[PDB]
Amino acid sequence: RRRRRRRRRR
Amino acid sequence: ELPQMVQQLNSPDQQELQSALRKLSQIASGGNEQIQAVIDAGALPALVQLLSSPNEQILQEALWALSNIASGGNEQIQAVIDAGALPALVQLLSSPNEQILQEALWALSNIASGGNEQIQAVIDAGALPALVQLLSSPNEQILQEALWALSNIASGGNEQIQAVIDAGALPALVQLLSSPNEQILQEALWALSNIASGGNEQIQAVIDAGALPALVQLLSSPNEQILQEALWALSNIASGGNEQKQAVKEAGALEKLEQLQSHENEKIQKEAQEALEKLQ
Amino acid sequence: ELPQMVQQLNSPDQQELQSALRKLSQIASGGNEQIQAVIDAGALPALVQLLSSPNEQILQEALWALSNIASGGNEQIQAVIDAGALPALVQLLSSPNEQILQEALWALSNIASGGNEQIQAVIDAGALPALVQLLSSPNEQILQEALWALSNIASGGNEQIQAVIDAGALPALVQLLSSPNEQILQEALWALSNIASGGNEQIQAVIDAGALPALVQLLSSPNEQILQEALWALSNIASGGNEQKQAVKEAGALEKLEQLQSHENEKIQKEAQEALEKLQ
Known part of the structure; x- marks a missing residue:
């Protein structure tokens, strides 16, 4: 039950 | 073993059902080929129907299964959409159970992590008023999931x-x-x-x-x-x-x-x- | 509370160890102050030792706990590097188990999401040849994690x-x-x-x-x-x-x-x- 979130800032 | 697990989703035995859901989400967590095998075995109509279950233990496993399937490619997300998961997910945004609410929010954010068509499907399902209302929640985990769902929707086109x-x-x-x-x-x-x-x-x-x-x-x-x-x-x-x-x-x-x-x-x-x- | 679970990360009982790991991941996912309390309690040397474990479940959980600690500030990521996590992490990039490999890549991308000092530590540990080799992978799930880790390393300075x-x-x-x-x-x-x-x-x-x-x-x-x-x-x-x-x-x-x-x-x-x- 593992939740991963990825975000990109230019 | 995949067509047997699919057949087991139509079981009235709650333990057998929970076990089959756990095993299908495990296969769905291992890549696009494995997700597609789960789709091709016909798991989706049963998963979508299980989102109407009033039992928290079943709902949690069914939502976890759908979010893993929705973690694949845009075509795999579209398969979830075509099976009608979105109206059932939007209804679960009214759930008083905070654990179910978090799982439904995570499933929605995965769908909204697809292309602009996938995001539009989330909007057309009426998810936005329920997402915005959830921004008043005193629960910090719900707030984080609602905010992540909105940021995925807002990562789309101008519309x-x-x-x-x-x-x-x-x-x-x-x-x-x-x-x-x-x-x-x-x-x-x-x-x-x-x-x-x-x-x-x-x-x-x-x-x-x-x-x-x-x-x-x-x-x-x-x-x-x-x-x-x-x-x-x-x-x-x-x-x-x-x-x-x-x-x-x-x-x-x-x-x-x-x-x-x-x-x-x-x-x-x-x-x-x-x-x-x-x-x- | 925290010293007990830190002691339990060194326990010979697999269940007491699994429970302590899951507890440590939960506290570490609740922000920088909770990450700092986990570091101050001395959880890092025990977590680093668990990266040499033959048990697949313990390994995935230790990698998940480290990825949570590494989601904090640059000084908190530096604490993970100073505890010697990197040689064990880089070694896990050669794993034939795709579940372990995904978690190792995720932990590394979190470490590489720090400043130039933290990124240089990842480079100096020899992560780049293993990452470049993974770009040839037929597994799309691993390929995406490897690309994400590489993009974080490339977010640093010209060096x-x-x-x-x-x-x-x-x-x-x-x-x-x-x-x-x-x-x-x-x-x-x-x-x-x-x-x-x-x-x-x-x-x-x-x-x-x-x-x-x-x-x-x-x-x-x-x-x-x-x-x-x-x-x-x-x-x-x-x-x-x-x-x-x-x-x-x-x-x-x-x-x-x-x-x-x-x-x-x-x-x-x-x-x-x-x-x-x-x-x-």
């Missing part, structure tokens, strides 16, 4: 961003800039930066909602991750026309950005330079 | 970007520009755009590797997220010297860039205008 604005996300997001919880704060900042990544009218709506004083104030945050999210939001705002650029300068952003060009963090100096470049 | 180039990442990234998988294509474009955010020598390396014809072709993509990624990669290349700007013009970018100033999406319009302005 997808406008839908987020029209549903009333901005006053709720601006209020969350007052949050003492740095994890909620980062998520609210990320959602605003995605809305500020649209056209001039979208950027103007962020300005009109009163986001600029709090954004400029957060550029002084001792937490560098918050500082960087605030800076990214302001850099997106600075992408606007002269009216938008003038509003940023009136809010006091120039003096902060110039000062940030000497900051210890190389990423901060770099992004402050690009922001200051857009403004002038 | 860190040059290390990525020196490891032979560019031919693998240019090859992935032909991928029919849109998620892989997006990640490959993001890795390339970060490399291209460096100085003229780093930008010229991207040009020499033959990225421009594929980038120019992707400006015709009907997928707006792919289009934006390609536009940002070209805009970064166009931020170089006259020789780099000339290469973009020679590759035939000007016509499509001017046409994209009238694209339906107002953000595409702005990005195309910014790119074209850098060139002229």
Whole structure:
């Protein structure tokens, strides 16, 4: 039950 | 063993059902080929129907299964949409159970992590009023998941961003800039930066909602991750026309950005330079 | 509470150990203050020792706990490096178990999301040859994690970007520009755009590797997220010297860039205008 979130800032 | 597990989703035995759901989400967590095998075995109509179950243990496993399937490619997300998961997910946003609410929010964010068609399907299912209402939740985990769902929707086209604005996300997001919880704060900042990544009218709506004083104030945050999210939001705002650029300068952003060009963090100096470049 | 679970990470009972690990991951996922309390209680030396475990479940959980601690501030990531996590993490990049490999890549991408000091520590630990080798992987799930880890390393200074180039990442990234998988294509474009955010020598390396014809072709993509990624990669290349700007013009970018100033999406319009302005 593992939740991963990825975000990109230019 | 996959057609047997699918058959087991039609079992009235709650333990057998929970076991079959756990095993299907395990296969679905191992890549696009495995997800497609789960789709091709016909698991989706049964998974979608199980979202109407009133039992928390079944719902949690069924939502976990769908979110793993929705973690694949756009075609695999479209398969979930075509099976009718979205009306059932939107109904679960009314659930009083906070654990179910988190799982449904995570499943929705995965669907909204697809292409613009996938995001539009989430909007057309009426997810936005329920997402915006969830921004009033006292539960910090619900807030984080609702904010992540909104930021995924706002990562779409100009119409997808406008839908987020029209549903009333901005006053709720601006209020969350007052949050003492740095994890909620980062998520609210990320959602605003995605809305500020649209056209001039979208950027103007962020300005009109009163986001600029709090954004400029957060550029002084001792937490560098918050500082960087605030800076990214302001850099997106600075992408606007002269009216938008003038509003940023009136809010006091120039003096902060110039000062940030000497900051210890190389990423901060770099992004402050690009922001200051857009403004002038 | 915390000292007991820290002591339990050294327990001979597998269940007491599994429970302590899960508890430690839960506290570490609740923000920087809770991460700091886990560090202060001395959880890191025990977590680092568990990276040598033969048990698959314990390994995945220790990697997940470390990825949570590494989601904090730069000083908290430095605490993970100072505890000696990196040699064990880099070793796990050679794992035949894709579940362990995914968690190891995720932990590394979190460490590489810090400052230049933290990124340089990842490079000095020998992560780049293992990462570049993973770009040839037939598993799309692993390929995406490897691309994400590489893009974080390439988000650093020119010295860190040059290390990525020196490891032979560019031919693998240019090859992935032909991928029919849109998620892989997006990640490959993001890795390339970060490399291209460096100085003229780093930008010229991207040009020499033959990225421009594929980038120019992707400006015709009907997928707006792919289009934006390609536009940002070209805009970064166009931020170089006259020789780099000339290469973009020679590759035939000007016509499509001017046409994209009238694209339906107002953000595409702005990005195309910014790119074209850098060139002229």
